[PDB]
C-alpha cells in the first residue's frame, strides 16, 4: 500500500502519493517562503521576488532581439525588470480583487493532524499587499544583481 | 456571367429562405409551439421530440450568415 487516501479520507478529491506526501517533499514544500505561515509576508515576498527576478534575466538577455549586440546585457535585463513591474502589478490587482480591508485571513486554521493553527496572514489584504511590495523590491533587486554579476562585475560564466 | 449570376440568385434565394423561415417560425412551429415564450436566442429545447438543436430564430440568423458570406464571396 503506497497510494493512500488524502489524509485517510477517500471522499476528498485527491490522493496521497510519494510525489504528494513524501517526508522529503513535504519538508521542501514547508521550507518554501510561500508556506512559512509564522513569518512576515514581506520577507517571503522579498525572497520570492529575488529568486524570480534573478531567474528572469537569463531568457530575456540570451533570447532577446538584441542578444547578439552590445546592448544585450542592459536592455534585456531592463525587460526582465519591466516584467516584474507587470507581475507585481498583477499581484496588486489580485490583492484588491480577493481580500477586503475589514475581513480577517481566509487561510486554513488546521493542519493534517487536525490541531489548531494560527491562520496564515498572507491570505489577507495587508498581508498580500506586503507580500506584493516585497516581491517588487526583491524582483528589481534580483534583476540588478544578475546584471551586476554577468556584466558589471564581469564574473566568468558559460552564458548558455 | 450567366452561370455566376444564376449562382448569385441561388445564394440570394437560399439566404432569404433561411432568414424568412426563421422570422416566420420565430413565434412557433409544430415542433415547438411556444417558441415565443423562450425569447429570441435560446440554445435548444432538449433532446426530446427527436432533438431540437438550432431551433431558435437566432440560430436561423447564425446559419444564414454563412450563406450570406458565401454569396458575397
Amino acid at each position: 500500500q503506497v497510494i493512500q487516501p488524502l489524509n485517510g479520507d477517500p471522499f476528498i478529491g485527491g490522493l496521497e502519493t510519494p510525489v504528494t506526501s513524501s517526508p522529503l517533499i513535504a519538508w521542501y514544500l514547508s521550507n518554501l517562503p510561500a508556506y512559512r505561515t509564522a513569518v512576515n509576508p514581506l520577507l517571503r515576498g522579498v525572497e520570492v521576488g529575488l529568486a524570480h527576478g534573478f531567474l528572469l534575466v537569463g531568457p530575456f538577455v540570451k533570447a532577446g532581439p538584441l542578444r547578439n549586440t552590445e546592448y544585450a546585457g542592459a536592455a534585456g535585463s531592463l525587460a526582465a525588470a519591466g516584467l516584474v513591474v507587470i507581475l507585481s502589478m498583477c499581484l496588486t490587482m489580485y490583492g484588491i480583487a480577493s481580500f477586503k480591508e475589514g475581513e480577517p485571513s481566509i487561510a486554513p486554521a488546521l493542519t493534517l493532524t487536525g490541531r489548531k493553527k494560527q491562520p496564515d496572514q498572507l491570505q489577507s489584504a495587508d498581508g498580500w499587499a506586503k507580500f506584493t511590495g516585497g516581491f517588487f523590491f526583491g524582483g528589481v533587486s534580483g534583476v540588478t544583481w544578475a546584471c551586476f554579476l554577468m556584466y558589471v562585475l564581469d564574473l566568468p560564466y558559460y552564458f548558455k | 456571367d450567366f452561370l455566376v449570376h444564376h449562382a448569385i440568385a441561388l445564394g440570394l434565394h437560399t439566404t432569404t429562405l433561411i432568414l424568412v423561415k426563421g422570422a416566420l417560425d420565430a413565434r412557433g412551429s409544430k415542433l415547438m409551439p411556444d417558441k415565443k415564450d423562450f425569447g429570441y436566442s435560446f440554445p435548444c429545447d432538449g433532446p426530446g421530440r427527436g432533438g431540437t438543436c438550432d431551433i431558435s430564430a437566432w440560430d436561423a440568423f447564425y446559419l444564414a450568415v454563412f450563406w450570406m458570406l458565401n454569396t458575397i464571396g
Binding site: - | 434565394h13 424568412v20 416566420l24 413565434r27 430564430a57 450570406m68 458575397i72
Partner: protein, 73 residues
C-alpha cells in the same frame, strides 16, 4: 476593388440584420389581437407556402447550376 468588396460585405451583413430584427419584432412586439386579418398576419397564415416555394427555387437553382458547372468541368 476594395471599395466594392467593402460595401458589398457591409450590405450583406446589414440585410442579414434586417431579417434578424424582423424575427425579433415577430417574437417580441407582434400583437396577434391587434393584427388580425392584416397583411402581416396573413404571412404567418401562409408561411408554409412561402417557405416551400423558396425551398423549391433554391433547390432548382442549386441543382441546375451545379449540374451545368460539373458538366462543363
Amino acid at each position: 476593388a476594395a471599395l466594392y468588396t467593402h460595401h458589398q460585405y457591409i450590405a450583406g451583413f446589414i440585410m442579414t440584420g434586417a431579417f434578424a430584427h424582423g424575427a425579433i419584432f415577430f417574437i417580441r412586439d407582434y400583437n396577434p389581437e391587434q393584427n388580425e386579418d392584416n397583411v402581416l398576419a396573413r404571412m404567418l397564415d401562409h408561411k408554409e407556402a412561402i417557405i416551400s416555394h423558396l425551398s423549391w427555387a433554391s433547390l432548382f437553382l442549386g441543382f441546375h447550376t451545379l449540374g451545368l458547372y460539373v458538366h462543363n468541368d
